[PDB]
């Protein structure tokens, strides 16, 4: 008896930490674009 192998079934991980950090950086930098007449 030889059961099927399932060791190859892998689940990738996402790494969008660069994008989240850049979004927060832009949300902070948009204060430098406010208009002060």
């Amino acid at each position: 008896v030889d059961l099927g192998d399932i060791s190859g079934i892998n689940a990738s991980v996402v790494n969008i930490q660069k994008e989240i950090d850049r979004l927060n950086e832009v949300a902070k930098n948009l204060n430098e674009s406010l208009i002060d007449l």
Binding site: L30, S33, L34
Partner: protein, 71 residues
């Protein structure tokens, strides 16, 4: 003078918002790719598990038949 300031600040803000939209699109694309890969992985695991459980069921039924034939 104030018009030049308004235009410059608006162009800067629009550039930053363009960058933010590009980064949001990239993040959503990565999340889509990973969610779809994990979905394909779960479906492959379910299919292989169905095959393996069918095999185990057949073997166990044969074993029960042999145990009946012996005793």
């Amino acid at each position: 003078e104030n018009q030049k300031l308004i235009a410059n600040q608006f162009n800067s803000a629009i550039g930053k918002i363009q960058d933010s939209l590009s980064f949001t699109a990239s993040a959503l694309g990565k999340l889509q790719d990973v969610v779809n890969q994990n979905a394909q992985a779960l479906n492959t695991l379910v299919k292989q598990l169905s095959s393996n459980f069918g095999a185990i069921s057949s073997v166990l039924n044969d074993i029960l038949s042999r145990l009946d034939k012996v005793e």
